[PDB]
Write a protein that binds this ligand. Sequence first.
Ligand SMILES: [Mg+2]
Ligand SMILES: [Mg+2]
Ligand SMILES: [Mg+2]
Ligand SMILES: [Mg+2]
Ligand SMILES: [Mg+2]
Ligand SMILES: [Mg+2]
Lengths: 153, 262, 206, 59
Amino acid sequence: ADIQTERAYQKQPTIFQNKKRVLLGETGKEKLPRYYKNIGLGFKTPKEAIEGTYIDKKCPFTGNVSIRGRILSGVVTKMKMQRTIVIRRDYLHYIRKYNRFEKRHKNMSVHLSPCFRDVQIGDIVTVGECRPLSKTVRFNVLKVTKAAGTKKQ
Amino acid sequence: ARGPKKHLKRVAAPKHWMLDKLTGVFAPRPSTGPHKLRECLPLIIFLRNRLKYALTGDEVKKICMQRFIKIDGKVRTDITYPAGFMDVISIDKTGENFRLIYDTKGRFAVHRITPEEAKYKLCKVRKIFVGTKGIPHLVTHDARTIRYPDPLIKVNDTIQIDLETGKITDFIKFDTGNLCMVTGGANLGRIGVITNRERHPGSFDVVHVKDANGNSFATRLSNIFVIGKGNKPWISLPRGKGIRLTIAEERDKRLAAKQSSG
Amino acid sequence: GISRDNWHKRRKTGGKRKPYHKKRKYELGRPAANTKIGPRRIHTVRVRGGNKKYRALRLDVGNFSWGSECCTRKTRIIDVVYNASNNELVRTKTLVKNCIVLIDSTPYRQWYESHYALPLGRKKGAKLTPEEEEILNKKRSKKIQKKYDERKKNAKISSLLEEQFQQGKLLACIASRPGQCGRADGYVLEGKELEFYLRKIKARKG
Amino acid sequence: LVTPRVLQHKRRRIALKKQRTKKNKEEAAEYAKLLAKRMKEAKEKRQEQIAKRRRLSSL
RNA sequence: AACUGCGAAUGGCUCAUUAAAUCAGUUAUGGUUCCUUUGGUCGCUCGCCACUUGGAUAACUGUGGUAAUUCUAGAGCUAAUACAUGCCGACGGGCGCUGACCCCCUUCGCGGGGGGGAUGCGUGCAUUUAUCAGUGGUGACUCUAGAUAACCUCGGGCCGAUCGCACGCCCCCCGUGGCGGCGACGACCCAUUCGAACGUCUGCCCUAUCAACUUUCGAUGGUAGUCGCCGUGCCUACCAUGGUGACCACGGGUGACGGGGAAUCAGGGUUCGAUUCCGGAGAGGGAGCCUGAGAAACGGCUACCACAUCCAAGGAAGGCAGCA
RNA sequence: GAAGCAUUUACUUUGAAAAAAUUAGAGUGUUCAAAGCAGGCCCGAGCCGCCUGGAUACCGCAGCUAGGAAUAAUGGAAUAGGA
Ligand SMILES: [Mg+2]
Ligand SMILES: [Mg+2]
Ligand SMILES: [Mg+2]
Ligand SMILES: [Mg+2]
Ligand SMILES: [Mg+2]
Ligand SMILES: [Mg+2]
């Protein structure tokens, strides 16, 4: 519900909240300033990252990761394991002797920031390489594309 | 390996050194310096293999220890000192004043320049940054750190510095239509005029170059050394002028030359 | 020795991997500092590259910042009162990077009295008279009194900080890593996180 | 033992200090006039752009 | 001879281990360390020896011990670019807070708007926090530089108590001082070179008479730490219940080090690669360390295990997968 | 020319980058050759030396780049939440 659900106070490290709030200000409404950055490579910052209130230190827009290296794509298959999803990347492997292909796949775990709210199984995501964020996570979700949906019953 | 390597096997040496096979197990192993290992020419092979002023390494060592070999105006007594590109070697007992620039086969050619030309060199800007107390610096393609440069100078431009002061004399910007030399890769040693630079964010920029004969080629931005304002080089180009001949027309030229002199 | 390598963990699939080399010197660890509160005791350790680190073993003073007033003063650390990692780090009084401590408030209130000229942290007043009256009044000149009044109109402090200054001890948070740098520095808790941590400390009580 | 060689070395060290602080002063002054002339040019180009705006706002 | 410095982490040997491991191509450090070389920087700090401070210890002399070793004890000296300790100069001040006082002001009784300022307290780079503003730069900084408040570890950061070769120049105040060229060595820091380490993507032989594995004792992820050169379950605490698999996980085998390559020879392909180049790993087997920029080193040390040498039986010394 | 592509891929062609050695291959009478990377030309002699080489190709798959767009996959307006 609220964002302070941990044992330690959750805050963006580069925002000073206690900026001498005195009688000349309104009580309220006050809204504490939000740190966000523009990652390069022509990727738009989602508006939910602009005026959201989540704290995520591994978010590419409001956190302390920097995207560099490889930009890949895949299809969401699991959405357990909080703030992290499993995507599947299918590809064809060429075998020279029979001069045909075979179908292979690899899973990678990627960090899904809470600026992407309506993410479902079967969606196509764009991921960017960052520094190691955990034992197995090295990529971070940059853009979510819906697949054959947008209309429900 | 538990630490840094100090040897270099003979077949693992750079190919453009043109070392043979049967005369040893080892290669000269250039010392640490202002040039990279694969992109340099240690003094021993320049003095023994190209100029043939010596026949062994001991002869190289004693003509170095007699303290007349000058690289960029300073006396160097280290026989495996990396000489590197666009660097001036002055003997000034015999009075040669070479300069190290690639020929069109990608190899360091013997190129004699005049004594008035040996005062300066061209350096390529690889970094600009502001040091403490707000004073700017730049780092060249050598290890040279120039303080207080012109504020118009940006990265991967070239600057003409003069030796024995280290000061910047003049510069040209990396711009479309300027003369350049390729300093690495497949087109190493070729000279042409910049026509296009298309940018790839994250990745490397590729620059398209057209030479005098209209043979257009492309290479990475890191292998571009601008050498002249628009069309006129600021240094003396070597024999062949950076124009790469195909094997057929080079065969024809060689046959015509041996027919004239034979 | 103690090692922080990777090749002893299981694979992502859960499979067990075999080591292909002995443990190297570059992948070592060291015993934790476990910095406590006491007279200053710092041991240096020679680290990779020949550089230095500082195991702060016992610390008593620190450099804390008010932040809202931009006043940084060296002050004494009294106690450890909350820790988000472990409660035993509280009950054994261990100084780590994100622990919540109690610091002496006299340098901050002394700066406040010297700067704004209002009595701060006084229960009933007129008790420490031969120092406080001369440090508040000065019988000062006119224009300097005007600039002091201009400071005075923006001198309100929040009630939580007010009652903390009455108690003489302020709640602070470490920001450095003792045992790596040898120092325990930080900032004074204010505002929403002061309310948050006060609520937490209240919550463990009963 | 104090020797006139030792005193000569001390004088040499002080002279190196003198020449490098003179170097710093000269380099800083030259760069000051360079930063005058450059971006004096950039200011006059911005003024030229403003004058171009004024020229194309009255036709 | 000995102290100090440096090197001894390269080279050489072998292929036991090792199956997404090693390794190859690709890419990354905006997530780190780096002796040396090269280029910057080295009066930027206001603060009763400096024409040079202090104590030792080798080699040396001499008295010895032990059966025995590159074993060492006791006594007497003496050095430093070893070990320490510590000025002067620049140095005139400037800048930022502090402000007793003094002057010109609406003036009328005041409200006054501007100015000088005595006295204090701090100042440079590096470190560790916190705040403010937004000189250069990237595709993208919580970058670089700036400003402020402080801190700055006695197993304690810089701010030269070092050494050669030429020997010259100024003298009034006054001839006894003061100045000077070229190096060597040295340095905290920045860059550079040589790298190293950790990561990204794709790629490996046979086996199902190996089909479900992993997860108490970290397995997958989250939050806060600890440690580390840094990113990370690397480790700890508290949480969540994850992660992988017939597109063959997990397990087992290999008479498996990987690759560049080699043999065969229509086109396809099948075998081989211990072996001179590159990468890895090991030094009888495991384990743990010291020193250093760099080693978990074995022509370093410590311990156990297995072999094994000398002994006067108290002890001592070992490591050819270097060349013979 | 700053920006973007009215889907995204596979495919195909091009361009960069894929150590050297080995292989293919150019030049060169090791006395021939296997090799090697060398060599060749005038001296009536000052000649106080001249010319020239040490190419090129290939380097699977994966990754990067620019043209094509047939073939093959895929996507957009149906409760219109359409342009
Ligand atoms: Mg050493
Ligand atoms: Mg084996
Ligand atoms: Mg092999
Ligand atoms: Mg090898
Ligand atoms: Mg080893
Ligand atoms: Mg060992």
